[PDB]
Write a protein that binds this ligand. Structure first.
Ligand SMILES: Nc1ncnc2[nH]cnc12
Ligand SMILES: Nc1ncnc2[nH]cnc12
Lengths: 504, 504
């Protein structure tokens, strides 16, 4: 009929008047042959494969106990609450503190993914998006700061490391010291570190108080399968009954329809696994509720019955303190976070330049203004309370549908503006819904393990120690250090002595 | 000179009179073109790459607490010793029991690797050797029986599972039900199960009471790096001082010269890593001694000062009890050990037949009499107290030097006879010397991970859950079950319903 004919000739005309206006001259839409309409399809598919890190990042930096401390705890029958009693849960005053910080990290992630993505398109003309990157969320929140105020480094110092690393990554890039520096790292340590982070981030998404709750303590094997139904109220311990938890099996169904959606190539599928096992866990009354009948849960439901809200940052705003940079374990956390960002935004940003055909004999057309926008956005992301940004590989779903200019990245920046207003629906995602989303990240990073040269022995001993010691010793710093230490001693003690025997 | 000329013409004549005697007619040395001398070189290189499993198997089945029970414990100030006080160490009576069982498992491994290897050559004419296979040592000793009498299944029942699995693997092979049965298992579950066993067997060789002592307990992260120097006398706990254990750093030096020996292609190298960090840990006086000044250690040194001994099996001889086969977790241990032997001796025994050129369009010349000798040897190995046998992949070092007949496997059977008489030197290998040997096994099994199809999603979700849940939940049964359960639900719920929609 002429109904679709009246629909098709308008899209032949709306794509002309955009290119005949001024906005086609800035983004250069005449060359880089494309139209206005197929840029909008390139940014819709980029956002849906990227919309999961708006909730994963909030539910993983609220476990850090961001600004809640011992002073704003509750009052009990004693004269004063002691040290470790408040920060392990079951409190009227501390749990209402941490419900006002997760509302300040959903807004602070959209405002960090706006500025990173909206400044990528306007300054570099490149079709990809930015957000706080996955992989360095778990290093700061679980290994530097730790689960609810553990560890040694406070959260105010951890947001000062991101500034001083962010300013160290502009002025190692503006001088030209990148190809001199990144090629110094060998291929096997660079490639096996991305596998071990994928196994650390999935062992996070299995524990009792972190994600679903499979693994647990044991007094002779040091880890065992619990999955227990009736557990301890105060702490997490198995009282009895294995594999019959209604919060465990509802999370497995979310893990299947995420994986049954990735095959058959549904673009956004990790967002539909989160929405399905959340929309069951909102009905009051069941055993899988996030809304119980406690006074600690009536305040979340009375905020849920309104579906939109304009919420402002008020707790985890600019909070920096350089008054702790004169001890030892601050700089070790500095040299680790400088290491994992140098290898994250180097192998990705050039690989996403050869898809779509930007590249010539080196030096694609947005080289110099993409290393700095990816670096300055960690500085503006550190004042707002979140971690470093990274150019996402999910942005490839927009490279395979015809996005080639910077109008892709501006529209991606405008869905994050249209998703900070839905704050009452995003703070209320349960921690067993975000569990399988931390496991499918580990599936997609282990897919690079078929490029490690397992033929030679020195390349396989170095790659095995780095992969193994990251999820076991519960440390990312103990896999980077114990990989370089094996790679030198197997190599320096015969080759370097042999070169120094012949160079003189 | 004529000195080597007088050496070379004798080896031209000694190789003739062996082939002109009757012993060249049985093994058929005229065809399969080879001589007597280069068979002896093929069996020397086969033994040295196989001599490590004479000490690893004894030091991993003595941690099981094989026949030592609560009745032959010591006597203390109380009227009777309680249950868990004896079996956790620090006892005059229980520790002298377990020093008489490790002397009955060094002899029982050589007598099991004799009969398996000496009957492979005489009945099948194939050049490889047999011993109790690595991979099923840790399943029985740490996961069925457990560390020193833990768990539910006693050791007398675990040696009855090996009989009833051994007799079930003759009469699934003699009827012809192997190609019908083994091809039913898909490729990804078959291939990823061999990677997760390699990561379970290496997490064993890092713990505080098992191997060296890196990982340890923690009350908030459930695993942490201890490596602590001054520990608890009774139990294992970190009192203070990280990374300064003299038993930790002596084990790292053994891990380097094992790995520095595998590259540059030294044939036996895992045996020279064990001998070097043992021969330092025999000098009385140091901090790394295996011979302290206790009465529990004077009895090991007074047995060490003699260097040869004829020792007889007296504790872990024929000990079978079918009086526990009417409960649940016995058969689950049966179907796991039947699973891992079906996939171990199928992908190996055909791969070791295409090297050396035995094969034609299927059906190499020792098909039917090698599935049964590999199966009947687990029956005769179960009466003597050790686990199932397997055709070793280290036997390939003899396939690449010209071994093609059964005289290779007979001579391998005669080095194990000449290494049961050195029992006082083999019981005295410390548990931190056997530690890195359990880690280089995990390096050599992870080298098959570059053949898993990480392209498709169903092949990568199934392979990731199987690899991850074996070293974490400390279970081999929880990786086989949780791999099939993901592989059906991603596949049966759309394909099988679609086939049943079209078949009718
Ligand atoms: N840190 C990161 N770098 C690149 N792509 C990512 N996708 C998710 N996290 C990422
Ligand atoms: N179980 C096993 N099967 C084959 N080769 C092996 N090498 C060591 N253990 C083995």
């Amino acid at each position: 009929k002429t109904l679709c004919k009246s629909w098709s000739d308008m899209k032949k005309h709306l794509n002309d008047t955009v290119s005949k206006s001024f906005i086609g001259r800035f983004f250069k839409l005449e060359a880089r042959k494309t139209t206005f309409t197929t840029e909008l399809r390139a940014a819709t598919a980029t956002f849906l494969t990227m919309a999961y890190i708006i909730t994963v990042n909030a539910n993983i930096l609220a476990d850090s106990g961001a600004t809640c401390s011992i002073n704003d705890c509750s009052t009990v029958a004693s004269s004063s609450p002691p040290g470790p009693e408040c920060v392990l849960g079951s409190n009227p005053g501390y749990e209402q503190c941490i419900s006002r910080v997760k509302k300040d990290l959903v807004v602070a992630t959209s405002l960090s993914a706006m500025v990173g993505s909206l400044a990528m398109g306007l300054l570099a003309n490149l079709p990809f998006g930015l957000a706080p990157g996955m992989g360095a969320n778990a290093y700061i929140a679980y290994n530097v700061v730790g689960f609810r105020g553990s560890g040694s480094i406070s959260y105010h110092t951890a947001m000062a490391i991101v500034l001083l690393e962010g300013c160290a990554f502009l002025a190692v890039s503006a001088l030209g010291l990148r190809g001199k520096l990144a090629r110094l790292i060998p291929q096997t340590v660079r490639l096996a570190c991305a596998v071990g982070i994928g196994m650390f981030i999935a062992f996070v998404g299995l524990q009792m108080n972190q994600g679903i709750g499979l693994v647990g303590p044991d007094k002779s094997t040091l880890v065992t399968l619990t999955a227990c139904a009736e557990t301890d109220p105060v702490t997490g311990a198995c009282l009895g009954g294995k594999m019959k938890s209604p919060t465990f099996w509802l999370a497995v169904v979310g893990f299947l329809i995420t994986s049954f959606g990735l095959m058959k190539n549904v673009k956004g599928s990790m967002i539909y696994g989160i929405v399905f096992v959340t929309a069951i866990s909102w009905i009051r009354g069941t055993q899988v509720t996030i809304f119980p009948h406690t006074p600690l849960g009536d305040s979340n439901y009375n905020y849920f019955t309104k579906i939109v809200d304009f919420h402002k940052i008020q707790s985890t705003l600019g909070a920096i303190s350089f008054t702790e940079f004169r001890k030892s374990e601050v700089w070790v956390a500095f040299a680790t976070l400088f290491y994992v960002d140098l290898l994250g935004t180097t192998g990705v940003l050039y690989t996403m330049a050869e898809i779509g055909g930007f590249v010539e004999d080196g030096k694609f057309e947005g080289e110099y203004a993409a290393y700095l926008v990816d670096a300055g956005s960690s500085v503006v992301g550190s004042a707002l309370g979140v971690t470093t940004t990274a150019t996402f590989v999910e942005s490839s779903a927009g490279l395979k549908e015809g996005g080639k200019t910077g109008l892709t990245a501006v529209i991606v920046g405008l869905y994050f503006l249209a998703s900070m207003f839905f704050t009452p629906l995003v703070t209320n995602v349960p921690r067993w819904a975000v569990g399988p989303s931390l496991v499918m990240v580990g599936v997609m990073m282990m897919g690079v393990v078929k490029d490690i040269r397992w033929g030679e022995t020195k390349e396989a001993v170095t790659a095995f120690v780095t992969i193994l010691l990251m999820p076991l010793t519960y440390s990312i710093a103990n896999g980077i250090i114990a990989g370089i230490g094996i790679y030198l001693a197997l190599s320096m003690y015969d080759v370097v002595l042999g070169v120094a025997k012949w160079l003189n």
